């Protein structure tokens, strides 16, 4: 699509610069109840309301990379891939979600060989803590997230992985998208636990929209606050590093005008300063406290001071952006989810009628690489310029047991979105921006939540019907290329 | 002070571009209750709360401009001033404030005359409606400004202005200072009628300075609403022009920050926006609503349509700077005053400990030229570059009532004032924004409000000893010249 000249070479970034792939552990490992795993949210939302996944499936089995870790790392080494960023699950280590109910010592020997096989094939772990899958131990014992509880468990789950792999391991990333994760798993309720106001349409719509996101949220950043004060204290040493991911939305002002622009600055406050403000600053966006008021909750003067300044790098996960439209307060409108707070509608069309950029396949991947160069110039000029990885960048092909193998491994939609997102990185490391590597989502097509396997995320093609063999598609011969 | 090369000249701005003068009737009119004229607030506020103006003076006679006015329409010829504005005293013409109570026919004929002796000599009336001086009548029944039915006796008022003097007079402004008004006269009480909360130093601290400063403002645009529909309807014609001046501090962030700038912008939607956005889009800024909530009323959809774009140009007083410094939300923070609303500090010192700019004379006029450049940029770029008026600029020589008169003419500090805001004005004018006049504040030493005769705003002397005789100072002698 870009013509030749256009297209990236490996010497456009530095030679320290990192590219990788991504995955979590729900989505690719299976073996959800082998070898001592105890359940975890996610099991427990598919397992009883499976009429919630589009296709009524379920992570049981997933990729099989409890098993199968071994075909993953061949993968990632045969495609030159400097990194690799994977999730360990929570209750796979502690399967009561506590220290008190013992820690899983097969749990423990599964990550170990993953890191050995990595490390012996020159491929550098960046681990994710925290990818979603919560101990429903926790849940059963105190609601988990929803209570202050979750703190101590989150951070003593932490301490036994610095532990158990911070020798090997030194780069970690506490929490993935905690706005995706409080907003879509406790507002609209479309994740597990599928929690959202009477009235709204979920599996349990028996929480509150309004307040149970915030809640969540400030729980986790307590919990992060807490974690990267242990990490600097006992595990970071000379070349330790630890930050945390979150998914951003580019926001484009609906018009260039002042409204807009004041809404597309709310809306970016709403996704992106939630989590970015309170770990650079110490606080939440004046924008969300002056908007939601009581329902956001107040830091204590100790944990404030772990908090400001409580990362060594901002992993970015980018996807897509939207067009932002104010919305005027009035006593016509009134707040039903915490993105309303936001007082602004996020539109995929703009005011000439025209897409913000094209569908991709799913129903909200639309393609506007711009949007990522935009989020890094934000973070250059306004947020200190920190050390950035993209944590997360890709899209998926629809499969709805139509898909024939062959079409699928010409996946040249996703070709062209890597192509074009790395141009627009180049760009932004061009201008300044300090960016140190790349991670693609995912390595292997994968269970992709709530719309089961229905989406394939994959630079390699999952047969599940096959074992679930692995097969490089069109896109990961290209980095393959790339990479040399 | 600026080096000779650097002083404007008359050729700098176009041919058609106005040079005047400004005042108001009760800062200078005199003959409070003479021929028939109804007492103002002003004339109470003074007569009951001598202690609460700092030389304990009053306007009763004030420059005798009610006996003395073709002296001031002689001063402005011989200056060479292209347009003159002036206001009219609501209780001069009607002396209970309504209809019903009757017009004050000597009141009409006087600035029948003045308009007529203005339009003899070439110089262009600029009327102002209101400047601040409530018929005390309408206080004793409804609390004037208080009550809604402030509206339909304001409307009435400005009716009988068309009516009289609409055939000679093609350019009105319907209020001055809503700003100032609202937040310094009910806010913090410094100005008649006096009003603040308990515990608030003032007068009259009966009142509320959350919730009275919104309630005259709100009833005010929509006066200002209703009028303009009136002038449109019944008296524009060919050539008339309507708008109303505004109070604009300049507001720099304290630092290069994203929170002080988020408080500088909040600070300018607090003063600016306040009335201009209601005027220019139908509503108040987002952020006042959303900080202030309940405290801010809503229009009427009626009244909406006729508030949107309801100018024809709009007036700037400028006067000075200062700096916004963030404020947090928090439990800790509760505000007293309506412009605590801002959740900003006004600082006229920024970080580094230096003043915005130096001080003139006065308790609050910072020399800051550079503010006005930032402001007429605003107003270019963000509100869509409405033709525009520096309805007032000028700064007080401080007199303790032994200034020397050789002395007080040698206005050297006036001067370089006003040399140096006309060059930040030219430069403002070559970058695009459409100012097309210019009026110093004053034309004459007046009252200055609560700080009586201690402050000498005039280009013009007057001696209140010697029956109010005019001299120019330094500064109109140097008008005179550039206006050749």
Redesign the interface.
């Given at each position: 699509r870009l013509s030749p000249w256009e297209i990236p070479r490996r010497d456009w970034f530095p030679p320290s610069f990192l590219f990788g792939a991504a995955t979590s552990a729900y989505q690719i490992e299976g073996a959800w109840n082998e070898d001592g795993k105890g359940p975890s949210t996610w099991d427990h939302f598919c397992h009883n309301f499976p009429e919630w996944i589009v296709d009524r499936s379920n992570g049981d089995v997933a990729a099989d990379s409890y098993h199968m870790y071994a075909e993953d790392v061949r993968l990632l080494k045969e495609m030159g891939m400097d990194a690799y960023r994977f999730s360990i699950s929570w209750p796979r280590i502690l399967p009561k979600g506590t220290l008190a109910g013992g820690i899983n010592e097969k749990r423990v020997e599964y990550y170990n060989k993953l890191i050995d096989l990595l490390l012996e094939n020159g491929i550098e772990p960046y681990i994710t803590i925290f990818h979603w899958d919560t101990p429903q131990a926790l849940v059963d014992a105190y609601g988990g997230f929803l209570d202050e509880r979750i703190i101590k468990d989150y951070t003593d789950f932490a301490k036994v992985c610095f532990e158990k792999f911070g020798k090997t391991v030194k780069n970690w990333l506490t929490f993935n998208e905690p706005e995706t994760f409080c907003s879509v798993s406790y507002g609209t309720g479309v994740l597990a636990p599928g929690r959202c106001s009477p009235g709204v349409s979920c599996a349990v719509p028996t929480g509150n929209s309004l307040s149970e996101p915030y809640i969540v949220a400030h729980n986790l950043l307590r919990a992060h606050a807490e974690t990267v004060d242990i990490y600097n204290k006992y595990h970071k040493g000379a070349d330790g590093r630890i930050g945390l991911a979150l998914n951003v939305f580019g926001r484009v002002p609906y018009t260039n005008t002042?409204?807009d622009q004041?809404a597309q600055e709310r809306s970016m406050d709403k996704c992106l300063g939630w989590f970015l403000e309170p770990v650079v600053?110490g606080?939440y966006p004046?924008?969300m406290?002056?908007?939601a008021r009581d329902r956001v909750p107040?830091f204590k003067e100790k944990e404030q001071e772990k908090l400001v300044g409580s990362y060594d790098m901002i992993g970015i996960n980018y996807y897509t952006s939207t067009f932002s439209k104010?919305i005027?307060?009035?006593?016509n409108n009134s707040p039903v989810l915490n993105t309303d707070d936001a007082?602004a509608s996020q539109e995929t069309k703009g005011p000439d009628g025209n897409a913000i950029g094209p569908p991709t396949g799913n129903a909200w991947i639309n393609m506007y690489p711009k949007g990522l160069h935009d989020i890094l110039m934000t973070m250059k000029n306004?947020?200190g310029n920190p050390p950035m990885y993209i944590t997360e960048n890709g899209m998926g092909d629809i499969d709805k047991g139509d898909l024939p193998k062959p079409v699928a491994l010409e996946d040249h939609t996703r070709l062209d979105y890597i192509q074009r997102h790395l141009s627009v990185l180049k760009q932004s490391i061009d201008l300044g921006a300090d960016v140190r590597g790349y991670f693609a989502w995912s390595l292997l097509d994968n269970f992709e939540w709530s719309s089961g396997y229905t989406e394939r995320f994959g630079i390699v093609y999952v047969d599940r019907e096959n074992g679930c063999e692995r097969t490089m598609k069109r896109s990961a011969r290209w980095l393959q290329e790339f990479n040399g």
């Open positions: 002042f409204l004041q600053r606080d004046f924008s406290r002056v908007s107040y104010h005027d307060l009035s006593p007082y306004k947020y």
